[PDB]
Nucleic acid binder design. Structure first.
Lengths: 132, 380, 62
RNA sequence: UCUGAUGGAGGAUCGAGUUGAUACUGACGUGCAAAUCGUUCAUUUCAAUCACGUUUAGGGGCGAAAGACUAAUCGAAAAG
RNA sequence: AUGAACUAGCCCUGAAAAUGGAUGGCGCUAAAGCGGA
RNA sequence: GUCAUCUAAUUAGUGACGCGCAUGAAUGGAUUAACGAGAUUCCCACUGUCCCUACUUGCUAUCUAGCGAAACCACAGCCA
RNA sequence: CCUUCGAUGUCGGCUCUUCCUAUCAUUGGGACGCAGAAGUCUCAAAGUGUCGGAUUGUUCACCCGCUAAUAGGGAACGUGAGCUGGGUUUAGACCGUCGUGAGACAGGUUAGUUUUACCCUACUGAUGAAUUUUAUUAUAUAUAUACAUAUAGUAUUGUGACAGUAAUCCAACUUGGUACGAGAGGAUUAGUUGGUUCAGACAAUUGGUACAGCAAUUGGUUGACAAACCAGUGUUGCGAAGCUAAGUCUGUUGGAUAAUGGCUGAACGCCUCUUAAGCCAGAAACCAUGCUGAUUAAACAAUACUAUCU
RNA sequence: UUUGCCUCAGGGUGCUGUAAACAUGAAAGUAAACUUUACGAUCUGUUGAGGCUUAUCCCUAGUGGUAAAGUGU
């Protein structure tokens, strides 16, 4: 319960296909909207590490397919500056399917999860095997 | 008819016209309001943009995602050799603005100061300020007494000493720094007792203080509307090029408005940025100017290889948080804040943890040349 | 001051300089500069690069 | 019937050249040019391409047909 | 000198549009306005 | 048009339905492998199309020496 | 059918600016069938902002979604020597209906050349003289003078009339599970930490960029090595410096008010915010402050030195 | 515009990545003599070498130079 997320370099605009990195059943997420995005004329809504997005799955279980559902980014391939003075980037973009309230509908995260997302979403940190 | 989709205009109309500045020197438009209670004190200073580095500091912001963790922040170095006070100018208020009553000079002025009055000093007879300086002291005291009686704004003429900097320029930058403080009786004596001696930066400013910076931005010649105003590029299919504004006005009024972005000069603009925090006032004397209590190394602010395009900072300097307008060697005028600030950032006491002096040319891995030679060992 | 160690080379990384990189397994690597980052990403081994400290060690000329 | 070779058919295929001209609705559009330039594209054993010679002449010719072409002139050429 | 109801002069509400703006302009209130003489 | 499908969202596409303003049989009907610089929809790959632009190269532009036109022109050229 | 048929380029979109208010949100209020929350009606108010997409040439529309809100309009249905050319609206061709036919269709479909600025002005930037029938907020040892003062060059520091102007909104948490409420629910205001859009800069770091530079290598060529060269930048790695955003930094407070709520207080023995006189508090509005120009004032001041000069 | 400046050099700082040459040096193997000799992509040592580094990097009273003196008032 603290949303002072601190700015992270924006990646993953609308229309990005990312991995699901969870055991919910989906295999990829197709970002269609970013929560909290405002109004700039030609600006594509883009998402960062802790951002909650609206997405659909293109590969996965049929009950998950063909539906609009909330997701939370956990790994981003675009380098972002940690305030300790260095830059970090993963190998892939990945987010977990989540209830609009914020609780994950799966049970575990396959890969590492960024610490910025972890401290933003508590139960995600609990379900995360490795926090970087 | 109305626009299908509204969006805010491009650029600020408050910085118009985007023309070249008159002078290279930053000019204070207005000084902070006079406070009678405070003792007399100087209000502005001049330095030169040497370059920038980054520092590490421990944050003390409770309830923040950073707080106890250490943070890297960019900081600009402004070399500030002591200024020399050479004159007093008194102003009095009239319904037509401020009127100079008179200016009183010191008994001696530097050749560096006198150079500023010449376009060709080398061929000149250097006769400026030669016989107006031996005026009897009685007239001096008379002029000061009249200034005391009638004037209400006092400024001290003071000039820089470029000979103490790596600049090719030899003529001094001179400017008037307004004295804010007690009554004119105290202001006049405060300036008179300093009418010839050097003015160090530490007298004007204290560490951890917010200041304003006045300077001329980096010039870029004439630039297109896309770069100058940030208009959107036209689609690739556009016939006579895409780097332009499509419609530069409706049919009526049958003119082009002044609010329409057009090509023209970009950069070399006068700017006054507020709220730059002084992180450290490094002194010429000490050898640990760039050392912190968490580093205890013996090093000065100049990075190995020298400040790129500037040189070595062998004089007093101040480490300014953030960036400042202008190129290297650009004269930056530091001004005391117009109204004192009681914000948390203004009152914060920064604890510098590390100041980087690695080479700014290329990607330097060492802080000192001694460290470099120790690492590599003997060579050919 | 505390400096880290580059992963491609043995160079010391002072604060505010380098860049990190996390692989699939969560293993984290630190690189001093863009050259080292690029070479590591192309997956060139430092042992076969003549100027690297790893090469100096393997050829026993420290 | 099946297998491997041989053989070298086809208004067969790719593709330079040749013959054209799909797109950029690119350049140019007071052009190099009263139709060009660049890239791209179609075509190459045939209903193929080229040259010279020769026939058909104006309410006529000629037309794998677009009112096309018939000397920058065509829903009736040009000259008087 | 109290309470009412009408009446009609001036004034006010009703009275919102796009370039900046027009009793022609300035302006004018012991009119330089309105109705007279 | 209605129902399915495609999408997240489908005046699009496809599959169906048919009292079809005004379909229909050499005015040829229905279908078709192969072929197409033909029209259309979707998917993968791809990428500056785009988010959102930046840097850079040649030739111009530009200043100079030389050379040197044209279109347009009642008279001209600030606005409410 | 008033102007234009010796031609005003006729849809939409994109781009860009400005304006209106009949205000969608944001600011401050009044009313409620108003407990709180949410909402509805309404006032002052145009400072700030009003989005990403699927289908369609579309305007219109309708869905998906974000948002605080996704308000309505004008500017020759703003905007084609700004673009585009999907539609409409020449010539080719197809279908259906109509016609004996040539052909027609406010029916459908497909393909179909988008010309010129070097002129004036406007606007954006860039040089720049000249300015006496001109100017003056003083100048003179507690004291006169406009019946006066002021030559000119260079150069610096200034004054600042006037013109422009800039910041905006949101979330989470604390107040607080508090006020309120029977519970269900559940604030306002303040504070803290962040963020969106916008604006102005900047390159310590990260990334981008390469006809600085090193290295590798393909084809060819100089007898070989070496050194090279050609392949319109031969191709590759890395690539300082410089530019650059996707990176970094910064983005005030006063006066007077509008709506409204009030004070004293008659008119009208009472009452009344005044629909008399006289006062107060008061908004993202206004004017200042601050910022940008100031050959926008054909503006001016002080200072330094000087020109056979006075 | 003579404690300056330009120039080259030296040093610094970086960029690239270990130069040319030599080596009864190595090298998958090969052939040719009565154990050695020829060919050999490539590798190693001398060699974090060599090259480049302001043209808009930094330092140096280090080298050489710093020119005719025209126009207006």
């Amino acid at each position: 319960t603290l949303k002072n997320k601190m700015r992270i370099t924006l990646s993953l605009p609308v229309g990005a296909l990312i991995n699901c990195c969870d055991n919910s059943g989906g295999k990829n997420l197709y970002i269609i909207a970013v929560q909290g995005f405002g109004s700039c004329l030609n600006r594509l809504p883009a998402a960062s590490l802790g951002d909650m997005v609206l997405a659909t799955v293109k590969k996965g279980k049929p009950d998950l397919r063909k539906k609009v559902l909330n997701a939370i980014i956990c790994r981003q391939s675009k380098a972002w500056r940690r305030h300790e003075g260095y830059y970090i980037y993963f190998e892939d973009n990945a987010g977990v399917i989540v209830n609009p309230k914020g609780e994950m509908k799966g049970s575990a995260i396959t890969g590492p999860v960024a610490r910025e997302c972890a401290e933003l979403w508590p139960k995600l940190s609990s379900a995360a095997s490795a926090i970087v | 008819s109305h626009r299908k989709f509204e969006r805010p205009r491009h650029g600020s109309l408050g910085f118009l016209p985007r023309k070249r500045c008159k002078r290279l020197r930053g000019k204070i438009r207005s000084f902070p309001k006079d406070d009678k209670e405070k003792p007399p004190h100087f209000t502005a200073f001049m330095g030169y943009k040497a370059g920038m580095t980054h520092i590490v500091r421990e944050v003390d912001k409770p309830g923040s995602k950073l707080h106890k963790k250490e943070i890297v922040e960019a900081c600009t170095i402004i070399e500030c050799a002591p200024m020399v006070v050479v004159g007093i100018v008194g102003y009095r208020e009239t319904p037509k603005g401020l009127r100079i009553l008179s200016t009183v000079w010191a008994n001696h002025v530097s050749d560096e100061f006198r150079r500023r009055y010449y376009k060709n000093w080398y061929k000149s007879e250097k006769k400026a300020f030669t016989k107006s300086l031996n005026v009897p002291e009685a007239t001096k005291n008379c002029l000061l007494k009249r200034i005391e009686k009638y004037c209400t704004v006092l400024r001290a003429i003071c000039h820089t000493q470029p000979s103490k900097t790596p600049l090719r320029m030899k003529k001094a930058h001179i400017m008037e720094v307004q004295i804010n403080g007690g009554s004119m009786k105290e202001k006049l004596e405060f300036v008179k007792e300093m009418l010839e001696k050097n003015l160090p930066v530490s007298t004007v400013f204290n560490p951890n203080e917010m200041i304003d910076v006045i300077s001329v931005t980096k010039g870029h010649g004439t630039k297109g509307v896309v770069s100058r105003y940030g208009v959107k590029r036209l689609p690739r299919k556009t016939h006579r090029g895409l780097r332009k504004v499509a419609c530069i006005g409706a049919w009526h009024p049958a003119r082009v408005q002044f609010q329409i972005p057009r090509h023209g000069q970009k950069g070399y603009f006068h700017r006054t940025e507020r709220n730059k925090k002084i992180y450290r006032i490094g002194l010429k004397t000490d050898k640990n100017s760039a050392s912190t209590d968490a580093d205890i190394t013996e090093k000065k602010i100049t990075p190995m290889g020298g400040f790129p395009h500037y040189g070595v900072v062998n004089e007093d300097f101040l480490l300014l948080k953030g960036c400042v307008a202008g190129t290297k060697k650009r004269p930056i005028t530091l001004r005391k804040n117009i109204v004192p600030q009681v914000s948390r950032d203004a009152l914060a006491q920064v604890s510098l943890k590390f100041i980087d002096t690695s080479s700014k040319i290329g990607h330097g891995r060492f802080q000192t040349s001694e460290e470099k030679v120790k690492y590599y060992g003997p060579l050919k | 001051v505390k400096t880290e160690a580059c992963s491609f080379s043995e160079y010391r990384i002072y604060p505010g300089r380098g860049q990190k990189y996390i692989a699939r397994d969560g293993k984290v690597y630190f690189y001093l500069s863009s050259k080292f980052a690029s070479l590591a990403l192309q997956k060139k081994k430092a042992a076969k690069l003549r100027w690297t400290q790893t090469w100096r060690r393997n050829n026993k000329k420290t």
